[model samples]
Target: AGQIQVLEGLEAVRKRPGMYIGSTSERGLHHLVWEIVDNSIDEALAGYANQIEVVIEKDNWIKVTDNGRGIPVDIQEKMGRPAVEVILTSSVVNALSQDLEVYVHRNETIYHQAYKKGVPQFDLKEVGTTDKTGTVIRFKADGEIFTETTVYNYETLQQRIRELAFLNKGIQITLRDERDEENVREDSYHYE
Candidate 1:
């Protein structure tokens, strides 16, 4: 009961979990996914993104891609301390999740950092860069937070992506679930 010292604004959220609430129940679990997705939605809303891609791997780790202005990676100064704490800080549609990974791109360079149960493994590192532009964030909901635990229903959630695509208009949102190995295929659509 003494782990998860994960985020700055997380104490009250984890305990009562109301205002910043619940990751214990199935209902609460849904909220967590929504929060992370909403961040991307906000980016798209500000007219920064033209397309978004969601790739879910192993039924857990989720990655979000956007073609908008990338997340800022430059360090800031305060109190003689570094901002973002080397590794840092989520949503159901609301990202108080215990884990996070953010990949920010700018000037054709890519920088990345990841956190486990709220602790960072390293400071942001310049992995490599290219003409690529945008951010890629992958996160998983912490199982320990819920009253009970179970794998997230894939087909159930996939339906929501189509809804979002319709809601946004012109902006594209695609979801890919890679938990199956029997029939794997990629590529899509037919305009000709």
Candidate 2:
């Protein structure tokens, strides 16, 4: 078997979370959760996983799951830690695996310029990992920063994800809000 090289460090993420994630604000916090979920979705696109689920438990705990190959369980040689551990710790992974370099480069350029202008930075945290082929990231946004009464709009998010599913063809994305009694309303809209 090929040895797995460690690509990043968790301590560095703790030291400079904003450099990888966008901000320490609510958007950045929630983004941590989304990044992990996106990885699972990418796995699903590759036919390695399916049936992704998100759960918002009490006390602001969020959980995501997928029926995929699961995250790499083996330890990494470079970091002397599990691959999942590295992913859960680092806020940003190289986009080469996902072919997302363009997006990352654009964001990095904007943020780097903003930093020179004395803007407060954003940060992200990765908490835990699992043995399954998919990935799940769960974190609570700092309520102090996410002071807005509503942090997320379920209907809007659901619509956006569904649109992505269609655009991607084979991939399927589902969002469920546990707090709401409504039947997880979902719809698709298309424009040429």
Candidate 3:
């Protein structure tokens, strides 16, 4: 009763992830997805992106691919680290069940990073060259923290994506389920 506790970096994140993100509950689960998709929407909102895709991969991974200006790979003036590295703070995922993988392409360069359990697990490096531009975040929700809950509801996500499409106009979004090899469904969203 007299001891005090202070968490550091990702530890704080893993300690109280819900506080930053909004739950171990299924609702919170969807909130996590919203956070990732919303980042891409920001690019579209700024007129940098036109299309975004959400793939629910097998083993519960969440992947969002976008075509935007891509995150800056140049070093930041303040931190002296690559903009992508500096921008990817511990609270990045908003706060992954599995290892997180991110790839960003800009101009003619492709950069990628990997994170595990709210921390960078590997070197964030330049991977290859791409004429395309955008970012891809692949991660899985850690059900460990959310042991007492339901599964990630796909219908709810589809409904939200469809609604977002009608509201956004011009922007394109796709929700794809790749879990079942037998009956995979891809729902595309776009409007005038």
Candidate 4:
């Protein structure tokens, strides 16, 4: 019998992206976008940078852009790869196994596992990067599974994200409906 390797730490996430972010369905597809956005929010919290933008373009393409310090371009001591690559990869993986506590008690584990077979892994492309200043990650959803072609709800998403900004304070979150210029809307909330 082969020795069983127990996945500890983020190993599980890397091994199964569907287990944390839900399935490659419309919901899971959007969760991936939110996961990346949350990382940008974290950067704002850390005082490194602020201003994040998420766009769900036409044809199931999603883009996450932030003016915050971009994913570290420097080499990591342990992984030895570009920090940006590591961040993108790990964030997708972490979406699967992230503790529910971090997401307001959402049970992503169950949702992701239930749709594992159909979940589609994302194809990430770094569209642009700046000197420790900002990053833009773009990916396409598995067109076959994401049948609900309706554009993202800007007001709803912005409201939730604004709450996060308030909870963290001094952070700015922005969401733009790039698919349609007439759909533009913006709002902010502050706590304290």
Which candidate wins on lDDT? 3
In model 1, which runs have C-alpha deviations exceeding 4 angstroms?
A: 1-8, 21-23, 77-98, 184-192
Query: Lowest-lDDT window of 10 residues in candidate 3?
Result: 1-10
Q: Of models 3 and 4, which has the larger lDDT? A: 3
Ranking by lDDT: 3, 1, 4, 2
lDDT of 4: 0.50
- In model 2, which runs have C-alpha deviations exceeding 4 angstroms? 1-19, 24-26, 92-133, 144-150, 180-192
What is the TM-score (0 to 1) of candidate 3?
0.88
In order of listing, the candidates' clash counts read 18, 12, 0, 3
For model 3, how big is the CA root-mean-square deviation? Answer: 4.3
Candidate 3: stretches off by over 4 Å = 1-7, 92-96
TM-score of each: 0.77, 0.56, 0.88, 0.60
TM-score of 4: 0.60
lDDT of 4 by residue, 39-87 (tens): 7777777786666666656643556666654455455676554444344
Better of 1 and 2 by lDDT: 1
Query: Rank order by TM-score, top first?
Result: 3, 1, 4, 2
> At residue 185, what lDDT does model 4 achieve?
49
lDDT of 4 at 152: 55
Model 1 lDDT tens row, 1-192:
112433444544555564564436776666666665676778888988767777766756667788878876656553222233332432232134557787887878888777765566677788997797788877777765754753666665666776776777767777777767665423221111
Give per-residue CA lDDT, model 3, range 1-192, as digits (tens).
Answer: 101121155567677767876766777778778888888899999999989999988877888999999988787676565677655654436233546778999868889887666555666788899989999888877766656652567899999999988988988999999888788989999999
